[PDB]
């Protein structure tokens, strides 16, 4: 059901391995589909469905715009450093924007952060920017005084962003709307029982531990759901139990790919 389009922009004053001076990543339903950085200087596909569906003009325009954004982000690091009276050093500037389509309604956001703390965010309902502190109030004033900044962002988030998200979902439908069943294995140590689900899609899942059919919530440990390299996901749940109550315990897995919850034993 729900879909999202998001762009993540990261600029750093001190690059390091794995961390270019500037990177932009676009994601649809949480999966990266395009990436640009200051070293390749090209917007590049990271999934097949995007290449097979847009023209070379898409790549050229995205590459030109990203080359322009690189410069802006370089300037914004400088401005932020001076607003906070900071010496040269290691700093980060990040911005994220995007839209969600759910049921009939639309959500959109645009927000930036400096050294990992909020700086400024759009309030799309009031067409104002919310400033985290005095430094960010100067930016609030600049963007609100310009007279068109919040309105252009409102337009992009509610219109342009949603229009592209619909096109993306349509291009990727076979990937994005597929269902892949979890492959589940139960293990145990010294007794710690572990129910691990491998390779499911989409990411929502519910793994519960039952003692003779009884949902043991308060005693269930759970990881964060995490991706595999092929765009499928992984999740686990453990239970700390007394050695040799073993027969009693079953793992239940609820997932869209499974018409009925799966039940698994050690």
């Amino acid at each position: 059901e729900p879909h999202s389009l998001r762009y993540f922009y990261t600029a750093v004053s001190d690059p390091s391995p794995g961390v270019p001076q500037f990177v932009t990543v676009g994601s649809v339903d949480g999966e990266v589909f395009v990436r640009y950085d200051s070293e390749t200087r090209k917007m590049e596909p990271r999934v097949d469905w995007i290449v097979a569906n847009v023209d070379q003009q898409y790549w050229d325009r995205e590459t030109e715009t990203s080359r322009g954004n690189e410069q802006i982000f370089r300037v914004n690091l400088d401005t932020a450093r001076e607003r906070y009276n900071q010496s040269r050093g290691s700093h980060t500037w990040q911005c994220m924007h995007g839209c969600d389509l759910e049921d009939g309604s639309i959500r959109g956001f645009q927000q930036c952060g400096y050294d990992g703390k909020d700086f400024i965010a759009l309030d799309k309902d009031t067409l104002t920017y919310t400033a985290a502190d005095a430094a960010a109030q100067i930016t609030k004033r600049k963007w609100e005084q310009e007279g068109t900044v919040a309105e252009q962002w409102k337009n992009y988030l509610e219109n342009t962003c949603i229009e592209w998200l619909r096109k993306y979902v349509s291009y990727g439908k076979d990937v994005l709307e597929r269902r892949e069943r979890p492959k589940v294995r139960v293990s145990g140590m010294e007794l710690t029982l572990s129910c691990r689900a491998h390779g499911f899609y989409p990411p929502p899942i519910s793994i519960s531990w039952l003692k003779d059919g009884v949902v043991q919530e308060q005693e269930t440990k759970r990881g964060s759901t995490v991706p595999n390299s092929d765009g499928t996901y992984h999740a686990w749940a453990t239970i700390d139990v007394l050695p040799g109550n073993r027969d009693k315990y079953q793992c239940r897995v609820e997932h869209a790919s499974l018409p009925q919850p799966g039940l698994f034993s050690w």
Binding site: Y9, G26, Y58, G68, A80, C112, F119, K142, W153, Y156
Partner: peptide, 7 residues
Amino acid sequence: MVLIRMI
């Protein structure tokens, strides 16, 4: 598709 302003 990826508005980006100076702060």
